[PDB]
Design an enzyme around this catalytic site. Structure first.
Site, short mmCIF file in Angstrom:
data_model
loop_
_atom_site.label_atom_id
_atom_site.label_comp_id
_atom_site.label_asym_id
_atom_site.label_seq_id
_atom_site.Cartn_x
_atom_site.Cartn_y
_atom_site.Cartn_z
N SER A 37 0.83 -1.24 0.00
CA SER A 37 0.00 0.00 0.00
C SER A 37 0.86 1.29 0.00
O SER A 37 0.29 2.40 0.00
CB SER A 37 -0.92 0.07 1.22
OG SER A 37 -2.02 -0.81 1.07
N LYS B 34 0.16 3.79 -2.92
CA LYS B 34 -0.87 4.83 -2.93
C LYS B 34 -0.26 6.26 -2.95
O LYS B 34 -0.94 7.23 -3.24
CB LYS B 34 -1.76 4.72 -1.63
CG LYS B 34 -2.74 3.51 -1.69
CD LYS B 34 -3.43 3.13 -0.37
CE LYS B 34 -4.18 1.79 -0.60
NZ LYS B 34 -4.63 1.20 0.67
N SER C 211 -5.54 4.04 4.65
CA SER C 211 -5.08 3.10 3.62
C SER C 211 -6.27 2.35 3.07
O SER C 211 -6.33 1.13 3.10
CB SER C 211 -4.04 2.12 4.17
OG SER C 211 -3.25 1.57 3.11
N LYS D 129 3.44 6.47 5.20
CA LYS D 129 2.46 5.61 4.58
C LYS D 129 2.93 4.18 4.78
O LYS D 129 4.09 3.85 4.51
CB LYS D 129 2.37 5.88 3.09
CG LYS D 129 1.32 4.91 2.31
CD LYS D 129 -0.12 5.32 2.64
CE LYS D 129 -1.17 4.25 2.36
NZ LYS D 129 -1.12 3.21 3.48
C1 LIG Z 1 -1.77 -2.01 1.64
O1 LIG Z 1 -0.68 -2.52 1.97
C2 LIG Z 1 -3.12 -2.63 2.08
N1 LIG Z 1 -2.90 -4.01 2.53
C3 LIG Z 1 -3.87 -4.92 2.43
O2 LIG Z 1 -5.01 -4.65 1.98
C4 LIG Z 1 -3.55 -6.34 2.84
N2 LIG Z 1 -4.36 -7.02 1.87
N3 LIG Z 1 -4.18 -8.17 1.41
C5 LIG Z 1 -3.13 -9.04 1.90
C6 LIG Z 1 -3.42 -10.20 0.89
N4 LIG Z 1 -4.55 -9.79 0.00
C7 LIG Z 1 -5.02 -8.64 0.44
O3 LIG Z 1 -6.13 -8.06 -0.04
C8 LIG Z 1 -3.77 -6.64 4.28
C9 LIG Z 1 -2.67 -6.98 5.07
C10 LIG Z 1 -2.81 -7.25 6.45
C11 LIG Z 1 -4.06 -7.14 7.05
C12 LIG Z 1 -5.17 -6.78 6.27
C13 LIG Z 1 -5.04 -6.55 4.88
C14 LIG Z 1 -3.73 -1.76 3.22
N5 LIG Z 1 -2.58 -1.27 3.95
C15 LIG Z 1 -2.21 -2.00 5.15
C16 LIG Z 1 -1.20 -1.17 5.88
O4 LIG Z 1 -1.24 0.06 5.65
O5 LIG Z 1 -0.36 -1.74 6.63
C17 LIG Z 1 -3.48 -2.38 5.92
C18 LIG Z 1 -3.87 -1.30 6.95
C19 LIG Z 1 -3.33 -3.67 6.71
S1 LIG Z 1 -4.61 -2.56 4.56
#
Ligand SMILES: *C(=O)[C@@H](NC(=O)[C@H](NN1CCNC1=O)c1ccccc1)[C@@H]1N[C@@H](C(=O)O)C(C)(C)S1
Ligand SMILES: *C(=O)[C@@H](NC(=O)[C@H](NN1CCNC1=O)c1ccccc1)[C@@H]1N[C@@H](C(=O)O)C(C)(C)S1
EC number: 3.4.16.4
Lengths: 453, 453
Positions: free
Chosen positions: B43, B46, B284, B394
């Site tokens: 992420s 972004k 995020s 971020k």
């Molecule tokens: C960006 O990094 C984004 N991460 C996720 O959405 C992540 N999603 N995954 C992992 C596998 N497939 C997905 O859809 C995730 C990771 C851990 C827990 C929940 C979701 C967003 N950014 C992260 C960050 O800023 O650290 C989160 C707040 C966890 S979500």
């Protein structure tokens, strides 16, 4: 050791390489560059699977595809259900299933009074690895290694897009496939064309919608699709073959999801394990790797196998033989998952285990041979002396990933085991054709260094 | 420079780190470690999207959701179709949609003689990035950034698992959601429980098959799911709402892909870009990131936008400003794709552009602040002086990836921009929450050293 770091200067910028190699005769590590870093093994993961299958299925293993009935044959009638049992045979053809069903005719059956029942109970949970990418799942190379697998769970359709801009592409699907392709793809002009996407969207019951557009084509445009519902497809194939065999059936298709008992009427056997392994290793057949990966778990744990069980079984079997995985992630038998993580040195310890137990395993002869067969018969870095007819190696490729794992003889006649993982290889746009010239140079140099060291 | 190498010894074995940091005041690189290696940015991607949005959409940008028609009102009747215009608003609530349909009534429409027509033509091709993972598509984090997006395109079901081993969990879909959940989940005893998967398989028209098991839970609980067919979901909601409003409708739902010309009857505007961006950056939000990504393409290129178009737009716009991507792969705006490949030094150059141009862009205030807000309010390595309330960053997370990109003030009150990409992190498998302690330690020591250097 070999200065691999200088050699990686020929790889595109941003790529990363894990290289480790061992002179087996001297027991010396002669290259060690990111050897402990976890990377994506791609299809070199199949090496793990070959070894676990040898150890736990053995050379006499064959997949079985069987007909059973809970009732009795009388007066040309099978008085009860036709049970067709599928156990993951990744090499079952439509012709082989037809001849198996024909055996009903020889036993005098000309009518089935009951229902068609599929037992696919040996595999459970999804028929795809966790961490597989979603948008390839409709492509033939990525067909589901499911309990029911006919003609690689793949069919061919033709798109006639040899027409003017603005015309609707004609979809042609050969009558032998019980699936439907529909939708309105149009031919786009040279202006709109670079902006087109040809998409397919999967709908229930093996219905495919093609959408979008493409440039005027000047040959027929193939689409090679993966069957999505493998039980429904196998059941529809079976109904048409019974009909064509002249066996009358008017009952329902049932998918009860647990083992079915009945009397054995006829069993089709695949080719045996050494044949399956040779083909999986020379040609890198994905479906044979993921089929074996779960067959290994089914047989080892004696229960329906998911990819999760396949992971547990392969590790436990290899660990007993002295392989250490630490926190490696093996999510599948073929290496397609983007979640796989394995360090070059772990792959290497399996390769040494392979060379050391050659008299029992006979896996050496399964490796592709440089300039001779399999996936490296025309491999650019390997096709000149002193490498050609010397390097043998399992390849792995995904977008961005170019790997080799195998063996060679150096200038002194000693055996060298080696593992090359390259990840983050990118030379242009996501959709454009990857340039292999930097790969060819790097591989020609590295294997030449290993030859001469 | 700082010795990042030494620091990465506290990270788990097999992980790989990419770290680069620049003292902006002195224009000096003070940490450079695999700074040119392509890695998965998660992420932190972004940041790119925020900058492209600022530049090509601007602070006055808002998503419009609209009702139009080609008929005329007369006797409380709308004598033609109701066209509902959706343009990707990732922040549209069910209440907002309702209030928008209410406008039909303030204007005295009693009933619609015609059909329901959805115009989603501003987005094009699939609503999911290339290289996204298939098995997560049902999770709410991963709900589709489609044109039609209502309440985060997410729902929950109520589950009751207070039952004994072998018994079936009770799953009830709450009344407001036009969704089916079917199939069944059993309770596992304490043995199976460790290795239980709850499986969800998507079928057409938002029908979800659940399978497998769960561990006994004393109390009832809700599970969130991503809506899969967003057009159908939206249209089912619009029809409930027209009834609740007392607007008579008895027509068909139509889903053309071309824009639908008609007379504007009413419209609703989202919050404007700065609020969207702040929520995206602070919390995020993946859906805001991927809608903005294609909204950028739609407005930039004046044509329907696929993710491939979003990629082109975001690169082109940042290139105009001096950013060089080389062969990076940016497959989406959220950074979810496993195909994304970006080097730390490239992310660093965009952060330098952000700080340089702060007077115009006002992106600094969107970053989470250590110990204070957003996703780093409790981040372990950052919550003591001198980092708490100082580091802004971020975050990015996936299985195996822990990244940070942003800024901090060092001991001399100079600003430091930094990129931390960690991949291949694994202290456990596909079925185990990995310990975050080595990451806490690494980050604490890394930011302390960047503080004092
Ligand atoms: C960006 O990094 C984004 N991460 C996720 O959405 C992540 N999603 N995954 C992992 C596998 N497939 C997905 O859809 C995730 C990771 C851990 C827990 C929940 C979701 C967003 N950014 C992260 C960050 O800023 O650290 C989160 C707040 C966890 S979500
Ligand atoms: C193993 O590496 C395997 N690779 C692929 O199947 C690979 N498939 N992908 C990429 C993402 N999803 C897929 O299904 C692929 C790569 C290139 C062309 C087609 C398919 C097999 N091993 C390879 C090898 O030995 O190098 C291949 C022969 C290409 S297929």
């Amino acid at each position: 050791m070999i200065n691999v770091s200088d050699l990686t200067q020929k790889l595109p910028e941003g790529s990363n390489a894990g290289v480790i190699a061992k002179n087996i005769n001297q027991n010396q590590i002669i290259a060690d560059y990111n050897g402990s870093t976890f990377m994506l093994p791609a299809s070199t993961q199949k090496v793990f699977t070959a070894v676990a299958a040898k150890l736990a299925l053995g050379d006499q293993f064959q997949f079985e595809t069987a007909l059973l009935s809970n009732g009795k044959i009388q007066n040309g009638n099978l008085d009860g259900n036709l049970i067709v049992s599928f156990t993951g045979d990744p090499d079952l053809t439509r012709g082989q299933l037809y001849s198996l069903l024909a055996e009903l005719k020889k036993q005098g059956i000309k009518k089935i009074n009951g229902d068609l029942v599929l037992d696919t109970s040996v595999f459970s949970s999804h028929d795809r690895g966790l961490g597989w990418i979603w948008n390839d799942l409709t492509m033939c190379f990525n067909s589901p290694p499911a309990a029911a697998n006919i003609d690689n769970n793949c069919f061919y359709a033709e798109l006639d897009a040899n027409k003017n801009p603005g015309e609707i592409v004609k979809i042609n699907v050969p009558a032998q496939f019980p699936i439907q392709v529909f939708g309105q793809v149009y031919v786009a002009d040279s202006n709109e064309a670079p902006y087109c996407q040809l998409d397919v969207v999967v709908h229930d019951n093996n219905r495919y919608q093609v959408k979008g557009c493409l440039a005027r084509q000047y040959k027929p445009f193939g689409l090679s699709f993966a069957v999505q519902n493998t039980d429904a497809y196998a059941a529809a194939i079976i109904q048409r073959q019974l009909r064509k065999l002249g066996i009358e059936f008017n009952g329902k298709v049932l998918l009860p999801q647990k083992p079915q008992q009945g009397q054995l009427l006829a069993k089709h056997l695949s080719k045996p394990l050494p044949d399956l392994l040779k083909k999986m290793m020379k040609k890198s057949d994905n479906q044979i790797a993921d089929s074996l990966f779960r067959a290994v778990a089914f047989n080892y744990y004696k229960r329906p196998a998911s990819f999760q069980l396949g992971t547990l079984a392969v590790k436990s079997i290899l660990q007993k033989q002295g392989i250490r995985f630490g926190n490696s992630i093996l999510a599948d038998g073929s290496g397609l998952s983007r979640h796989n993580l394995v360090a070059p040195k772990t792959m290497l310890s399996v390769l040494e285990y392979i060379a050391k137990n050659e008299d029992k395993l006979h896996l050496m002869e399964t490796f592709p041979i440089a300039g001779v067969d399999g996936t490296i018969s025309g491999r650019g870095g390997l096709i000149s002396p002193p490498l050609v007819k010397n390097v043998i190696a399992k390849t792995g490729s995904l977008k961005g990933v170019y790997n080799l794992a195998g063996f060679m003889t150096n200038a002194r006649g000693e055996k060298v085991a080696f593992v090359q993982f390259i990840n983050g290889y990118s030379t242009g746009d996501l959709e454009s054709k990857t340039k292999r010239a930097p790969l060819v140079q790097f591989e020609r140099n590295l294997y030449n260094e290993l030859y001469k060291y």
